[PDB]
Design a protein around this ligand. Structure first.
Ligand SMILES: Nc1ncnc2c1ncn2[C@@H]1O[C@H](COP(=O)(O)OP(=O)(O)O)[C@@H](O)[C@H]1O
Ligand SMILES: Nc1ncnc2c1ncn2[C@@H]1O[C@H](COP(=O)(O)OP(=O)(O)O)[C@@H](O)[C@H]1O
Lengths: 577, 123, 43, 459, 60, 384, 239
């Protein structure tokens, strides 16, 4: 190929010589485990490599082998219930072969090459196609896996095998220009797989957990990142959402993670079943996780991995959920790497090679209709490690500039734990505007009315805290403190949710609309009560207050059981006291 | 309605200019056979030589090759390999491939003074 | 009092650390000057 | 043309190829490469034997052979028409709409020439925006360059659209004709989004405002490099229509936050010191030149009526960028933090709210013969309000003189109403009107800015 | 029934509006269609010379 | 050059009520303002450029908004000298400058008009120079540096600071010449510190060079007020030389009353603090006494408005008078409250607004206004 | 971390509070946040021997997780070193235990080895020799500390002020192991002891240390004042 050998090392960077006429960025095997670098610099002849693995123990003059192509990743069957993870290599086999460890440089096939599949011709020969047709199915699991002509690939069909079971290593469809369509292909991973038109949020993409949704709805590109101090909820809200979705396909990348953080985690998805179905959640979810015990840069690599898988499937019309932990990875990655390669800084190790790529993730992200004419909308879910544990950082700020919503979390609540401990006080959603029909369609309109009317409470409660601490909650008179000890409940089963108490775990809009309404009543009843001179003290005794506390113990079947239930009891006794 | 009217007009104008492009291209391509092609060569050949102080190279199609035996003798004292409607040639060491295709005249001009022809058309 | 304390500090520290970056830059600058002076005096 | 050999340095989208020593400053090249892809470079800096190219693209797949270098211009210019009226444009200065390109009917440098300051007709030219906010406080002539310090949930675009619909002339305080004052819809871009995308688009469909419309367009998917180039491009189209087709050009400079970012990179990559909080200081300059395109034009009814737009980091106007941005620009707009939260449409604060024009060439006739001192009253009047907003919030529940109540009282009033606009007109008197109403409960005899007359005049 | 009056107001407002706009594009477009052909036909004439002219210029 | 060193002793004059008055400043001196953004910097300048005492106006703005001076070109011919009514273009050349002009041109600019100023100072004809922002020098210089790639000192600043600053001013002065005729050099340099950094190289370095610091806060001024400086973030250092000059010229007691005025103005800080500690919750006497007093004194009575004729154009004697009102009010107030009067009753004394309307009283009228106004004092006090 | 078996068996400590606040089994990180005037040293020692695993409580006989420790004293003082001697001699703690030592005086680099070294010992012996092993270094303060003066010699920017960023890297190596494994009755529980910079949960010095890993203990010197034994973080406190 493009060739030559090694020249110098400076830890995981390498430059190499003997290289000429050399492409810019490829698969760069080097040495004795083909060591997987990248042509960064071309000056002279002299390629800055950067590996993606441990490098060590080596010397000068080792084979340096430059493909003529960079990662263009096998797409196509085997997909779901998958691990290919960051190195691109499916753990399965490896797990055994490398003892129980992970061990450097250990190649395998990047797919189960000889696993047969449900060749469905949808097509006939002599026929003329374009890049991005579908040719074929492989319904595997529930799902009609579209056998995509990949972009740039058009025209004559020589033959079309009859249906059956075929490994991907069999080509089933020979083109009459001469293209033996084996059932995977290679898609340059930093090249964005393109689309037909970007489309336009219409409907929320829900995925559970009440307030978060009700207040802070989403686009179907979505995005918001979670700023969140260490410890915070974030890390397992993704995992909450592992259960709870509206998704089509389900894409989870563990983004360079340490193992104990992630033991139970790894298995736990395999302990989740499917709720669209009931088989394993693995029958639509994919382990893409990889490690903190491989370099940073393979995380950087990882990132591209996510998106591209998503794209493929998104092109298969899919509501794709991707929820990557931590841009602290991505960041970090290049945030050192420059230095290695010594290039000019920016402060806080920020390479202003920066929200380029950040941005780009989003650009690639969206709601769309694709080349196949197929809709899809990959929804994206950022998390962050705040560096002081608190914010300062452009890598958040302009990040805000370029994400859908934003989020914001609180330490203090974490003490009690709070699922979540969101601070809307910070946080917002703009998606609050694009979806609005679908509110009052699915719900009905007084969710768009009542919801603002719920904020207002806590809104003036904020203002009131002031006075609470400025005097007491006491210089106060009836009506104020009303609203004050309303607020509590509004939070209480809105910021206590729980992921182990099973009822607690799931919530719908049904589960929503209901509980919003309850509270209102109390307000209004007391509102009149105390203007009938009554002291709210008496109101405390409502057994009904605990009763609303049973909300996330009421479950959806029982939700029109419990709904109506409390209504009357309010309106009676306190309309009489 | 108005925007569609504007476009309509534009649609036609593009088609027109585009035809004119095709014809020129086609026309220029029917030149080589003609003996006014061996003639036309050497203009650009010499011009390229003017461009290259130190001259070393020069390329001509198997048909073309004959036309410059005059300036195969002159120039880089060289003729080798094939360009098309145009001339390439390297000089000043190699290093500097500094050419002037008649088709390199085209990519400048066609688009350039495209303005006047279109004016002639519309106007 | 302690609230506003912690402010100053936060500030300070960043300001301060700035010094380094400078230096970090300057270091490389020195590197340049010295590279020039190695292969314009040498070659 | 001149074709060159060899890489000399590649890494980042920074280029070098030797054998080049023979070029003029600032040059549009291409780099044909046998990949089947051309790529493009500007000769940002020249050297005696190679030079600095400024690539526009990914570097990727690049190799030492494919290497073909290409003079496009040794200068930089572009053509101009008003056929480009109504037309869509990528940032590459290519009209992407599937309409075959318009034709250059003149061609001129991108950077264009400086301007006699004496030759620039003064601004003075009040028109009505229909937003009191403007239409009292900062005071919109035409010429003006003013910007909306903005960010998180702060909603420029939205607000801009108001203007897109409520831009409207006033020939009428000045007894003129009415064909006199055509604007020019001109739009530019930077980084932009999809969620923004249609949302924008819809106002050209809603306001027909594809009307005379140049719209340069530029997301971020596109490589970085052209972020800063394109401004100028559009900015140059402007003059042409501005003088020669006499428009009161609606200039939609369209965030500028990204500008500097990339630019800086390119900088420093070579070397340039930041000197300024991780930013090259000559940013100032770099954005100066931008703005230096300005002016009502003598002898021609060009008026370079500017909307610069920006994000700014955090809330902070103290940030390096919005800093100098400040220095430069005439006007000065901030959106109120205060008011997103409680949702007022539009959230606008009365804080950087004076500009640089209201008196000077202006303030009556064009306005009306009582306004100035009203406005001028209201400034400190309102100050006086919110001042106690804290002090109170320890000291009394009240303990004020309830004259001093009024003061603080009058804020909340004024804002609550004022700072919500519907899709209203609002005209100068519809302003004044309101103004007096807030002044009303404020007694006469405190109104020391004002003279006796006007106040009771306008009760 | 005053609510009824208002309902009735809608009807005509929606109906006529629809119809007129529905016509409007069609008509305009078809005038565009007409004009478009006629400029091609202009072009035809001034085809040949443009190319002739163009061809001479590039040659040296 | 000059013949020899000569002291100034004649003040600069244009009667801005603090800058001049409460900061008496040499004619041969030179002094300065900074500026955060859009902070009224240049706006100050041109009042001064007509109510000057100086001999020669000298316009430069140092790589500035074209737009911001596009105007003045046109204005100044149809501006009006007091002595003559002439186009002010008689005594000015106009070297206004902008910012697509060379960076290096930005320097030239300075370095020309300074020298021109000398040529006339030489001729005994005494400078009024105004620079829009010396920072632009900085801004250029170190960009030279960079581009020439020379390591510049800390803060990202090469060091020609004191160097190119201090020297130039030293040319300045009330200076007798070889031709006798003694040119004062009265120049007022602005600066653009974007940071409020009293700690920008340029700021501090230049503090304690030439006379009289004055400061720009912005959001104060964002109200009515101009010229927001911190009063106690400003100085004068020429309050002995001219003390003769005032002593006669205005009045012999002119610093006595003026120093007595400023006395309160800063001494008031005594009270200020408590407000910020615990309000004027102690709404009491010698507190809220002083409070209102100092307030008014500045509220209008230093607060000129350039954008009015009469608010900002004024005389010494006009102002001189004015201070004496207030004083007066104070005087009788001392004995008012002592009588048992509450400040309350003092408060709605109508005659105070009569005292206020001065910025609307022209200098001729001013006498009689004042001549009346003293009286109502004694009338609206003694009775009670 | 797809080739192990998650943990569940329970680090029984003779200090209630611990086993109150936390959950404390055998595959984890628990960073003890400390300070001058804070008594860490004792605690891990105390609970050294006052730690058992009791599986009886979990329905397995107690013949089946064998109690051993490692802990090698680095970077620490004279006096402090010289303390723990008899304490070992008191319970027979040293019996199954290794101190490669440093005691703050031997080349920097040693300090940074002996951690992963100390680790790796167990990495063999824990699973291979099926030992259930308690691990808790001291003075990871010194790790980072020293580590930074290392990379001073390599001259790349401090990842953050006064800190390496290439820090994070190592923090892989430490923690990216623990607890039982498929087919193996080892286990490792590896527990940090290092102060916060003083008091200050705002410095990457602890912060990043936070972010990454599991657990978090602190002790409260604002309970030294009362002298509560144990004292803890009362509301930050998390396993
Ligand atoms: N919603 C919650 N609020 C507070 N703490 C929680 C919550 N849910 C889980 N935790 C605790 O936080 C631990 C860490 O998970 P998570 O909160 O997502 O974040 P991180 O990775 O930032 O530490 C959990 O193991 C659990 O101990
Ligand atoms: N001396 C002044 N008197 C009255 N208004 C002033 C004065 N100085 C500034 N202003 C007002 O405050 C604004 C802010 O100052 P600006 O002129 O923008 O800044 P600069 O003078 O620093 O270039 C002015 O545009 C004007 O509205």
């Amino acid at each position: 190929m493009i060739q030559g050998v090694i020249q110098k090392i400076a830890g995981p960077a390498v430059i190499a010589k003997g290289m000429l006429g050399a492409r810019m960025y490829d698969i760069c095997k080097v040495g004795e485990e083909g060591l997987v670098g990248e042509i960064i610099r071309l000056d002279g002849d002299t390629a800055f490599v950067q590996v993606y693995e441990d490098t060590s123990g080596l010397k000068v003059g080792e084979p340096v082998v430059s493909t003529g192509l960079p990662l263009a990743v096998e797409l196509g069957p085997g997909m779901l219930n998958g691990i290919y993870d960051g190195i691109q290599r499916p753990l399965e086999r490896i797990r055994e072969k490398t003892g129980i460890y992970i061990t450097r440089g250990v190649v395998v096939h990047a797919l189960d090459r000889e696993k047969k599949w449900a060749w469905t011709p949808m097509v006939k020969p002599g026929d003329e196609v374009r890049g991005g047709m579908v040719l074929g199915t492989v319904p595997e699991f529930g799902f009609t896996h579209k056998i995509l002509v990949p972009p740039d690939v058009r025209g004559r069909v020589k033959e079309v095998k009859p249906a059956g079971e075929y490994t991907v290593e069999e080509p089933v469809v020979v083109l009459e220009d001469g293209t033996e369509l084996k059932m995977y292909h290679t898609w340059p991973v930093r090249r964005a797989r393109p689309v037909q038109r970007k489309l336009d949020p219409n409907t929320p993409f829900l995925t559970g957990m009440r307030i978060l949704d009700v207040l802070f709805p989403v686009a179907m590109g979505g995005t918001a990142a979670i700023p969140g101090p260490f410890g915070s909820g974030k890390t397992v809200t993704q995992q909450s959402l592992a259960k709870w979705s509206n998704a089509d396909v389900v894409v989870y990348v563990g983004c360079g993670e340490r193992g104990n953080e992630m033991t139970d985690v790894l298995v736990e998805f395999p302990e989740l079943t499917d709720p669209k179905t009931g088989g394993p959640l693995m029958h639509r979810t994919v382990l893409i996780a990889n490690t903190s015990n491989m370099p940073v840069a393979a995380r950087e690599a990882s990132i591209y991995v996510g998106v591209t898988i998503a794209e493929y499937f998104r092109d298969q019309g899919f509501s794709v959920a991707l929820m990557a932990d931590s841009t602290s990875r991505w960041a970090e990655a290049l945030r050192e790497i420059s230095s290695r390669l010594e290039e000019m800084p920016a402060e806080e190790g920020y390479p202003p090679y920066l929200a380029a790529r950040l941005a780009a993730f989003y650009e690639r992200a969206g709601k769309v209709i694709t080349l196949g004419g197929e809709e899809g909308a990959v929804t994206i879910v950022g998390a962050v490690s705040p560096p002081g544990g608190d914010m300062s950082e452009p890598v958040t700020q302009s990040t805000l500039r370029i994400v859908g919503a934003f989020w914001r979390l609180d330490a203090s609540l974490a003490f009690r734990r709070h699922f979540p401990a969101i601070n809307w006080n910070g946080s917002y959603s703009l998606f609050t505007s694009a979806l609005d029909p679908w509110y009052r369609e699915n719900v009905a309109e007084d969710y768009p009315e009542l919801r603002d009317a719920i904020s207002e409470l806590l809104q003036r409660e904020a203002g009131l805290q002031e006075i609470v601490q400025l005097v007491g909650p006491d210089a106060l008179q009836d009506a104020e403190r009303l609203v004050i000890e309303v607020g509590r409940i509004i939070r209480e089963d809105f910021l206590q949710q729980n992921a182990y108490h099973e009822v607690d775990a799931y919530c719908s809009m049904k589960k929503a609309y209901g509980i919003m309404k309850m509270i209102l009543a109390f307000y209004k009843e007391a509102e009149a009560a105390i203007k009938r001179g009554v002291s709210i003290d008496e109101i405390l005794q409502l057994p009904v207050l605990e009763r609303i506390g049973r909300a996330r113990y009421v479950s959806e079947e029982e939700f029109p059981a419990y709904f109506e239930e409390a209504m009357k009891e309010i309106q009676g006794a306190f309309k009489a006291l | 309605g108005e925007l569609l009217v504007a476009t309509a007009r534009t649609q036609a104008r593009g088609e027109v200019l585009e035809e004119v492009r095709r014809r020129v291209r086609e026309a220029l391509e029917a030149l080589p056979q003609k003996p006014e092609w061996p003639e036309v060569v050497r203009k650009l050949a010499l011009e390229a030589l003017e461009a290259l102080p130190g001259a070393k190279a020069l390329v001509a199609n198997p048909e073309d090759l004959p036309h410059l035996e005059a300036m195969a003798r002159e120039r880089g004292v060289e003729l080798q390999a094939e360009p098309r409607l145009g001339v390439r040639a390297v000089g000043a060491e190699g290093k500097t491939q500094v050419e002037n295709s008649l088709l390199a005249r085209m990519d400048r001009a066609w688009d350039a003074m495209s303005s006047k022809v279109a004016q002639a058309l519309w106007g | 009092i302690p609230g506003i304390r912690a402010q100053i500090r936060f500030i300070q520290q960043v300001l301060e650390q700035r010094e380094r970056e400078d230096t970090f830059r300057l270091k490389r600058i020195k590197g340049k000057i010295e590279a020039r002076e190695a292969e314009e005096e040498g070659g | 043309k001149k074709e060159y050999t060899g890489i000399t340095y590649i890494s980042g989208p920074l280029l070098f190829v030797e054998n080049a020593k023979d070029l003029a400053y600032g040059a549009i090249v291409d780099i044909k490469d046998g990949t089947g892809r051309v790529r493009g470079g500007q000769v940002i800096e020249v050297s005696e034997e190679y030079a600095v190219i400024q690539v526009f693209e990914e570097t990727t797949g690049l190799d030492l052979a494919t290497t073909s270098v290409s003079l496009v211009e040794d200068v930089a210019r572009l053509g101009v028409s008003k056929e480009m009226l109504g037309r869509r444009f990528n940032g590459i200065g290519k009209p992407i709409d599937g309409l075959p390109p318009i034709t250059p009917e003149k061609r001129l440098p991108i950077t264009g020439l400086p301007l006699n300051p004496v030759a620039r007709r003064k601004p003075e030219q009040f028109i009505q925006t229909g937003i009191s906010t403007i239409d009292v406080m900062n005071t919109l002539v035409r010429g003006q360059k003013l910007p909306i310090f903005s960010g998180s949930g702060l909603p420029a675009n939205e607000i801009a659209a108001q203007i897109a619909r409520q831009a409207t002339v006033r020939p009428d305080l000045s007894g003129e004709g009415e064909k006199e004052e055509p604007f020019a819809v001109v739009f530019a871009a930077m980084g932009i989004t999809q969620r923004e995308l249609s949302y924008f688009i819809q106002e050209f469909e809603r306001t027909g405002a594809l009307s005379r419309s140049v719209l340069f367009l530029n997301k971020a998917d596109d490589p970085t490099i052209e972020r800063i180039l394109t401004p100028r491009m559009a900015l140059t189209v402007a003059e042409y229509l501005a003088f020669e087709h006499d428009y009161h050009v609606l200039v939609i400079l369209t965030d500028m936050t990204n500008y500097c970012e990339a630019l800086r990179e390119i900088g420093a990559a070579r070397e340039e010191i930041p000197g300024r909080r991780g930013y090259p200081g000559y940013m100032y300059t770099d954005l100066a030149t931008i703005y230096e395109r300005a002016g009502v034009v003598e002898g021609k009814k060009g008026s370079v009526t500017q909307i610069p737009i920006l994000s700014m980091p955090d809330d902070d106007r103290t940030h390096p960028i919005p800093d100098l941005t400040g220095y430069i620009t005439e006007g000065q707009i901030q959106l109120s933090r205060e008011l997103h939260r409680k949702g007022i449409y539009p959230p606008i604060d009365p804080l950087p709210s004076l500009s640089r024009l209201m008196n000077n060439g202006v303030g009556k006739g064009k306005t009306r013969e009582d306004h100035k001192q009203v406005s001028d009253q209201l400034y400190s009047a309102y100050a006086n309000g919110v001042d106690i907003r804290k002090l109170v919030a320890i000291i009394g529940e009240d303990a004020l003189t309830e004259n001093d109540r009024r003061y603080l009282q009058f804020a909340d009033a004024f804002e609550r109403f004022f700072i919500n606009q519907g899709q209203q007109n609002r005209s100068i008197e519809e302003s004044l009107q309101i103004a007096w109403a807030l002044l009303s409960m404020l007694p006469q005899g405190e109104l020391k800015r004002i003279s006796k007359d006007h106040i009771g005049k306008y009760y | 029934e005053a609510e009824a009056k208002a309902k009735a107001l809608e009807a005509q407002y929606r109906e006529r509006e629809r119809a007129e706009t529905e016509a409007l594009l069609a008509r305009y477009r078809e005038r565009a269609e007409a004009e478009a052909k006629a400029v091609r036909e202009k072009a035809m004439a001034r085809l040949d010379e443009a190319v002739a002219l163009v061809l001479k210029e590039v040659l040296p």
